[PDB]
Structure formats: structure tokens, C-alpha cells
Design a binder for this molecule. Sequence first.
Ligand SMILES: [Ca+2]
Ligand SMILES: [Ca+2]
Lengths: 690, 690
Amino acid sequence: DFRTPEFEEFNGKPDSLFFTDGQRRIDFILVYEDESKKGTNEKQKRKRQAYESNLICLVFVKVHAPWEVLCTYAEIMHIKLPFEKSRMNDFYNPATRSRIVYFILSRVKYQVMNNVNKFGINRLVSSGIYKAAFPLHDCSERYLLYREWAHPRSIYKKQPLDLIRKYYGEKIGIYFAWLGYYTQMLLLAAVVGVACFLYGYLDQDNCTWSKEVCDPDIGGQILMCPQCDRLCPFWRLNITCESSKKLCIFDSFGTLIFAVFMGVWVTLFLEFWKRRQAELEYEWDTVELTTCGKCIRVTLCASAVFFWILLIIASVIGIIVYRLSVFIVFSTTLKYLTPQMATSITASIISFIIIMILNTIYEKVAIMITNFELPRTQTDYENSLTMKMFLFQFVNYYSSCFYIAFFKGKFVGYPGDPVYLLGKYRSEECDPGGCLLELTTQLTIIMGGKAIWNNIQEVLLPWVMNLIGRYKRVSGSEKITPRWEQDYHLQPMGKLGLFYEYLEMIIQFGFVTLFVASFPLAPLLALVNNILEIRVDAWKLTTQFRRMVPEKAQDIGAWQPIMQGIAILAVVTNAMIIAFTSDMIPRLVYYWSFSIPPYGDHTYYTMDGYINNTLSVFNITCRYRDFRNPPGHPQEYKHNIYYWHVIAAKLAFIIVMEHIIYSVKFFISYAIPDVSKITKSKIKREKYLT
Amino acid sequence: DFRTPEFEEFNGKPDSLFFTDGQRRIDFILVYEDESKKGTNEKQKRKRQAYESNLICLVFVKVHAPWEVLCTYAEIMHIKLPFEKSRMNDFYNPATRSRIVYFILSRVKYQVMNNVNKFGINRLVSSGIYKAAFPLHDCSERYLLYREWAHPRSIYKKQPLDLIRKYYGEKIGIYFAWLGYYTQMLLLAAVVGVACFLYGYLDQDNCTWSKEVCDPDIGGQILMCPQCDRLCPFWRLNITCESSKKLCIFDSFGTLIFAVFMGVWVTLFLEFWKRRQAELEYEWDTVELTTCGKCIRVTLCASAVFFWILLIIASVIGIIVYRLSVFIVFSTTLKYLTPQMATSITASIISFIIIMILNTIYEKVAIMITNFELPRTQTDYENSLTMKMFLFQFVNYYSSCFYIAFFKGKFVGYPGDPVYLLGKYRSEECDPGGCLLELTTQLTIIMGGKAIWNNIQEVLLPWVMNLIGRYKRVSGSEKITPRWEQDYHLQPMGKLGLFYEYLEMIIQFGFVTLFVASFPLAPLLALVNNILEIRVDAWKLTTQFRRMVPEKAQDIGAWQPIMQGIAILAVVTNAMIIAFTSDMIPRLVYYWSFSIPPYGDHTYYTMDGYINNTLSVFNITCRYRDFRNPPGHPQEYKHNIYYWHVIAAKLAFIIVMEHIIYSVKFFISYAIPDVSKITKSKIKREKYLT
Ligand SMILES: [Ca+2]
Ligand SMILES: [Ca+2]
């Protein structure tokens, strides 16, 4: 009855936000048009027309809710108006104003005489009756947000973090506060992250770690053993040094001050965000408002889902395979481009490419898994997607690094016996450089290669897809184009809005905390990323994408239990980065227990002569990066005291560095009040002083 | 004005709970009398008389609140009356009824013309104006609670846990639910705790662990080295076996199934109490309702407090000293009472005595610390006392065990060099039995000696102190003694009521979870304790002690963050009980890596010949429980491969057993819904179905 908000087609002013009569400002536009399958056109018309009829208090339909109709659902949900505030009304905003008219779009459904009870635009736009329902914005509130925040000129400026909630809402504001804070806490781990390896840069020469390695009369003698079986040469340690001279900054003590700092920093990063969310819990309001057959389907999906997890695990195996083949050519074919780091650059590019391809499969297959599973509407759907998409992106992004980490440079044996992966082909081995540069280049050109490549995808892929709406649809308009046609031609965002833009940071946060024993610059590269990503995600959210609905979330949600699970994992893996993949505990032990006269030939503590005095010679019956017995002895190619010393000091380091840092991350979490103390002085002035 | 509830002295019926007129039932009695310093008697009278005056709507004063006066504070606090319920009134109890008249005793203070504003009986009874304000009870509700619950005849009966809240309240009920549940979860760790060492009891003979030890032709040969310097003999391993034959049940695999079970059990114990408190969150209602100089004083108290902590640490040193002296006599002076276990029984009695003495100092000094510090009234006072009294009782009770645990049987050296505690006196050493029996006897006669001795203190010390009120005050009364005189003569409980009765269980829970690698019966002894302590604390709370005020607490409070800190500590210390103090990882390594031909002389896996093939011989320049090099070799009395193998497998076991169990205690805490599922089906019928 009387549905149609009549087709008074007049669009005289292009930058308009009002009706014909004025003084009425838009909150949201839906659109659908059916004049042109074959017999269901008016069926979708009668499926639509009863919804807008009780809503009352191409051609794109306006909405508006006046004083008597905005307030009658502002008594339903308890809105805080203004200073001080109170629930559900207090007399003294288009960030608030277009959530109430979406709260209006929450309760009211449709009335059928044949029992199809359809509610909201959840199924309305997905079945295909509507095409796009959206809000829109201004030209000002928007124009001053370009010059100060959302421009590449205003990168050095402070963030208008109030003027992000007041324009975009707590879905977006609590991302950009968490992007600005995590930019700030990266800075106090970048400047102390620069400083620690600057001492590693200053002390580059005089510790006999790359001092012996660059001396061809005594560090050129070290004729190693070829890794693969056929077509690999016996090589020396001249050719390592070009990598060994910058290896002296990646782990002398630069890590062991920083990795014991990052364990302190991440529990200072998380716990001061607990104080940061709590003072944004106050200044922004943030308050809440057959069965067996089905079970079997869900279990199959849960079980069916892991296999993909199994598949991603499998791809890395292909990289291991590809690496061996590609590595062999590398030596024959050829700025200090040694084949040890050529394969570590080239075949780490080829892996990173396949990470970006198989992300896009994961981008789609985890959706097709989840809707085939039984979700909730929109809140436990993404929360079932969170532990399913991220857990794909965990093992997509980090299982390559977790290969080059703990279990790549292991598994040698009796003739230099590889494990052979229980197949007829050989297995691979690390180079006697305490292989870390194969990791920290893989770490760099992922977390800096994702930082480059996704900031091309987040910049021009919304740009050229809007030019699909410009070079392919209409060009040369009436030169006064009305506002909603401009804003509709901007592409939408997806139902899950900032899921993809949190996930790409939790991937970055899982690089600056999981793998930071090695690469202390991983704050700095992620500092200059977050200096730009806070403008890139500013720009694409203001120019290109449509206006997100300003829904309210109190914390980030479902990534706070992940970072709290990443940080607990980060103490275990940083300690396993240091012991099992960093070659400094084999140096700490030599300095402290093999240059002393038991098993040693030197008076006081000195690192002179470390490299030949670690490895194991191998009769033809060359040296290699192992702690095994020399041939010709009582128990040859079984282990030494030295492995069993070092693997004990390896495993004691895991035990000491976890139990100290997990106590420090308990003391720091104890000795910090979780709600911030000035806000504890501010919330107590809101209940007794009213 | 008109204070005195007039002295109509008539006490005709002895078991009375009413007034002269009847139909009015008591809730609470205060008492004070001043007819007999020297000039302040009427000063305490005028300090009293204005309080009871506005309360209106030896001789012991009744209280009573009728319908119009009970309800007017039952609208202030939101009481749930009954089935289903609602806040602050709903029309369809002396557990509830005498909390409202204590809620009446919360707001109303006194009116002075000279500014002393005194509120309640907090300072009223502590300054000395009143002597005892208390409630009292019946003869029935009480009489059927004796026959079924609070009698040593009714020990096998099920607990009337509803009929503890409905008589005593959630202060007491949530203790007795937590005493009954922790009795039940001890039972499913007693029956699987009996079973695991019953296989240790069945396989007592055929593993060459006590098979060699009892064979004097080949296990009598092992002429060890005396521990202390003067007056200690060279001894053999005949004399160990009497302890080695029951040592074969304390740790073969009995622990490694149970200690990996107890890590699963305690996170099943805690997490099913989360479901147990939540279904008691529903069935019982449980809903809430100069500065610099001062800072310096608080800091000094905080710092001053540790020293006592330092002192308790110091006493153990005296035990170490006393043990050495007492041990020396033991050998000379003498049911298989070998001196290895005689000192472990006798000098572990003498330590347990001094634990009970220095508990009583800790019982008083932590009070004198806390009131000299700045508390809150009664809630952050005990919560500041919780982390101060228990942390004394932690290091009082467990630092003796943590001495006999990780750092007693260490620190030998070059001539068998003790550390000498940087003094001229010698240090002590363990016996080659993988010293654990010095712990599990210390563990038994503490946690079973406290269980005996405190259940004498909790039984007859309230009994004979009531007989101080019977044999020393009045005997042979009018033979119809009125009720409040009987109940006043029962001794009071203390301000902190069940603090002392939670703490003695958290001490027991810190014995069944911290030290359970060894002594799998520590559930069973604590099962038969909690079978009796749930009747002993039933009996003393019903017969001897006065009626506690039925205040409401939702959970136990301030011991749930302690057991959650005990259980996280329990995974670290059980693994350090197994590796550093249990001698099975030195057996696991021998079986798996020294009976194989590297460093071995036997074809397949066999434990034949373990004991001589572990220890280190010592030239006169005897064997002892060390993994050190034999004299006369390349690096003598420095370590072996074998220490460095075993200490690696020690430290890998800490790493494997923590990271598995902390993941299992993460999976079990994930795969269990914290609110119980039937209550999740029950709370959703209380908000939408009303
Ligand atoms: Ca971005
Ligand atoms: Ca007791």
C-alpha cells in the first residue's frame, strides 16, 4: 500500500544530499529496477514492495528519519548523545545518524500470505532483488579529512583519531587507533631496534665471526662438502664471507638484547593497548546492546577444512623440491651475487609469488567451506571465518619461514646421510653459516614484498575497477552529476569489511614478533610501512571505497585472542629462532666452554679460532655444519659432547628465556593496571558525581 | 532518645528464639554492659546509645525486622525470592533473613555534636564498646543437618549442598561445594592414581631397578663414598635396597602416566569447576550489588614484608645444617630402619614441627604487617592478606620440599667438592637412589601430618576453648538455659572466616599438584582426608563455632587466581620433579642410548646392568651419584657425554612435557564450554521466556 517514494526525477544540483524541498538530509540509498528470467520480473517486484511500505514514517531511492521516527528507535537501542553523556537520550551526527536508519533496517521484515518470512537486506541483496544498498557522504567534514589525514602530503601529521569515529565509526576508528598505536609502539622498537644492530654494525670486525671467515689463508682452507649428490662442487669459505660480513649484524648480541626486549615490548605493546582501548572505551562510548545429519555435515566440514591445511603444508614440500633443482642450476650459470644468497633471493621470490596465488584460492575456498557449514548471520560467521581464514594465512605465510627456521638445516647423517624424505630422491642441507640469511631474506621479501604488493592492490585495484565504471560504462556526463550516481559507481567493500585489513596486519605482527631474533629492522620496515599504510588505508577508504556503515565494536575483536596467542607463541619461537636456527649458542658455548683448557688450548676467554673448531671433518669413506664425531675414532659420526653440550645449552636457553620472559610477561601484566589510571580517575566521576 | 529495648528479664523457655509475646523471631544479638577505665564508663554509654535509637522501626539484646522494615532495605539491595526468581521482590528464610538485618547494620551510623562519625560494628566492636555481636540458630533445619551431614555416622552420605546455602550461605556453601567437588575429582584421580602404581606394585621385580640393587654379589659390590667429611663410612648398595624395592613403585612409569594425567586432570579439575560454579551461579543467585609519606610507608611495608619471606627461606638453611649434624649421629647410633630413611623420617618430623611453630608466627606477623599498611575495610584487606599470608605459607610449606627437590642433590665436584655454601663448613649430597624418598616421605608426613594435626586443632581446640567457658566460668546452671547464653559461650570465628579453611586446602592442593610425579597416592591420602575434613569442617561449623553471617560470594575468590597460578606452576614443577629429582630420565636414556652398541655392549634393548653403568668412580686422589668423567682420563671430573645427554633429555623433557601439556591445557580449556551446557539451556529460559 502506497509504497513508491514517487519518481520526481530532478537532479539539478550535483553535490546534493537533500530532497526537492531541502532541509532533509539522506542517510542511506537502496536501489533496484525491474522493467527488463522471463516471468519473474513482477515476482521480484511483489517480493520487494511490501518492505518499504511500512518503512514510511536508474533512480536511486533516498531514506530519511525525522525527529519523531529517529527517536523511537533511539529509545530502543540506548544511544549516548552529549563533555558528559547518558543512555538513550540526553539533550546537549552522520556517523551516528546512518546507523539508526540501519538499525531501522534491522527489525522490519515482510508480510506474506504464503509464509516466506524474509527480514532485512541480508537475504534481500544476496538473492538478487536489490543490487546495492549503501550510504553516502559529503563534498567540510570530508574535505578537511583529505588535506590533514587522507593525503600523501599529510603523512607526517598527527592522526585525527576522533575525526575517524566521528566520520567512519568504531569499526574503522578502532582499526586506525590500532594502526596508529602500533605505528607508535613500532617506533619505540624501531629506534631501539636500529640501535642494537648499529652496535652490530659498529662491531662488524673484531670478534672472529667473519674475521676468520674472510681470511683466505686460514678461512679459505675450509673445503666444505657439496650438498646435493650429482653436479655440486666442493667449496670453501671465501665464498661465504660476503654473506658472513653482514651476518655479523644479524645475530652477535643484537638479537639477545632485542629478542629479550621484544618479549618485553610485545607485552608492553599488548598491555598498553589494554589501557588504550579502555580510554577509548570511555572517550568513545562502546557499550553493548536430522540433527545428527547436520552434526555429521559440520564435522565433515571441520575435518574437510584441515586437508586444505594439509595441502598448504604440502606446497612447501614442492618448494623444497623446486629449491633443490633450481639450486643446482644456480652454481653452473654463475653485486656480490653468490649462489648461496642467489637461490635464497630468487627461489624466495618464486615462493612468495605462489603465496600470493594460493592466498587467492584460500580467499575463496574458506568462504565456500563456511557457508556450506552452518554459520550465524554475520557475527559467528566471521568468527568462524577468523580461525579458518587466518589459520590458512598462518600456514600459508609462515610455514615457508617455519621451514627455513627449525627443520631445514637438520637431518644429516652417516655418509652425510640425508633423510631422503623416505623416497629415492635426496634431501637438502644448510650451509655452515648458521643458516639464518635464508630466513631473513625470506622474511624481508615477504613482509616487505607483501608491503609493496598489497599496497598496489589496495591502491590501484579499487582505482582501475572504478575506471571500469568510467571508461566502459559512461564518459562525458551532463557535467553536473548528482551525488548518489557518483557514490554508487564507487565499488563496494564486501560484507566482511576490515577483516582483510586486520588480517594483513596480524600477518605483519606475526612477522615482527615471531621471527624477530633475526632481522631487528623488522620494526623499521614495518614502521615505514605503517607510516604509509595509515595513509593508504586512509585514502582508499575515503576516495575509492564506499562509506562503510559506522557500526560499533568495543575492541578489535577475534584478533585480540590471536595476538594474545601469537605473543605466547612468539616467546617459544623467538627462543627457537635463537637456539635452533641462529648459530650463537654454538658460539656462546665455544667462547665459554671450549676455549678454556678442557677440550681447549688457550689461556683466557677468546673467540680466536671458532670456525674450524666447531664442524666435523668427513673422510672419503670435507667439513659440514654438524656437531658429529670425526671419522677414525671410537664412536664416529655419532654425536659429540659438543652437540650434547650445545643442544643442552640450546634447550636450556629455551627453558631460561621462556621461563624468564613468561614471568616478565606475567610481572608486566601484573604491574600494569589494565584500565588506564587517568581513566580510572575519570570513570569514577561519572557514577557518583551524577 | 528512647533507646533501650527494655530489660524485661524473662527467660522461661530455654530453646527459645522469640520475644515475650511470640511470633517474632530473632536475627542477631549484640551485647554490651557497663556498670563497672574509671571515668569513661558512661562515655562508652553515650558512645553507644545513639546507634540503636534510630535502629528502631548479662542481658543480650534481640533484633527483629518486620514486613515493612525488612522490605525497605530489600528494595535497596536486590534480593531474589522465589522454581524461578526475580530481583528485589517477587512473591511465591533465616539464611537470607539475618543478612538483611546485617545489611541494616551497614548503613546506619552515629550522630555526634563533635564530629566523630562512626559507622557500624566495624570499629564498634574493635575499639571495645561492644564485646560480641552475633546471630544464633535453632534447637528441624539444624537437627536434620546433624544426622545426615554433620555426624561421623553420615560420612558415606551424599552432601546436602543446597541445605548448606539454605542454612549457612554462599561463603560456606561455595566452600563445601568446592570441598565436595574436589573430593569427587580427587576420587577419579585416586582410582586411576591407585591403578598406575599398582602396575608399579605388580611390576616390582623384573626391570633391573632394584633387581641389581638387591643382589649382593653384583649390587653389593658398589662401594660408595661417604658424604660428610669426618665420621661417615664407605657404604654399599645392599643397604639401599630396602628403600630401592619400594622405589620401584614411585617412579618406573607410574608418574609418567599419572603426571601426564595430572596435567590433564588439574585442567579438567579447574575447568569443570568453572562449569560447577556456573550451575551454582544459577541455582544459587550469586549476583553483585602527606601522600608521599603514606606512599613511603606502604613501600616500606611491601619491602619490609619480603624479609620475613627472606627469613623463612633462611630457616630451611638451618634444617640443612641440622640435617647434616643429625645425620652423622644416625649412622653411629644404629622395621628396615636404614639411616638413609631414618634421617628422612626423623629430621623430616623436626622440620614439620618447626613449620607448625613458624606458621603461628606467620599467623600473627602478617596481620601486624597489614594493619600497619593501609587496607580497605574488609575486602581488599583480606585480598592484600591473601597474597601475603599464602605467600608466607607457600614458602613455609613448600620451600622445604623445594629444597629436597631441585637443589639438594646437586653441587658435587672435583674431589667430590661440595660448594661449602661459601663457608668453612661442608655441604650435603644425595644418595645414589635418585633421591626422591627423602621427598615423598617429607611430602607424606607433611600433607598427612598436617591432615592429622590440623584436624586435632580443628576438632578439640574449639572444643576445649568452649570447656574454658564451662569448667572455668559456670557449671550447673538453672538446667533450662536460654538460647543466646549458650550460643554466646560458643567461641567466635574471626573476621576472616573461611580464609584459614581455604588456605589449608590450597596448601593440600599445592601438594597434590606440585609434587605429584612422585607419590601417586597423594590423591588417596587427600581423598580420605577430604572424606573426613568435609565432616570435620561440617561438625566444627555446626556444633562448636557460632553461626557465620550468610554473606554471598559468587566464586571462592582470590584462590581461583592462585590455583590458576598453582596449576601453571604445577606443569613446570612436575616436569622438574620428573627430570631433576626423579632418576628415570637417566634410566630412559640408558635403556635407549647406552645399551645400544655406541657406548654399549649389548645387542637389543635391555636394562640389565644399569647401576654401575651410570655413576662415576673416584680415585683416592668409590662411586657417587654423578655423571662425571672417571679419573685417569683426558678431562677427568669434568662432565661426560652422559650428563650432557641426560641433562639434554632432562631439559628436552621440560620442553616437551610443558609444551604438550600447556597445549593440552589450552585445548581442554578450548574444547570445554565454561558455562555448563544444561545451564546454557537453562539461562536462555529466563530472559526471553519471562
Ligand atoms: Ca591496507
Ligand atoms: Ca578444616
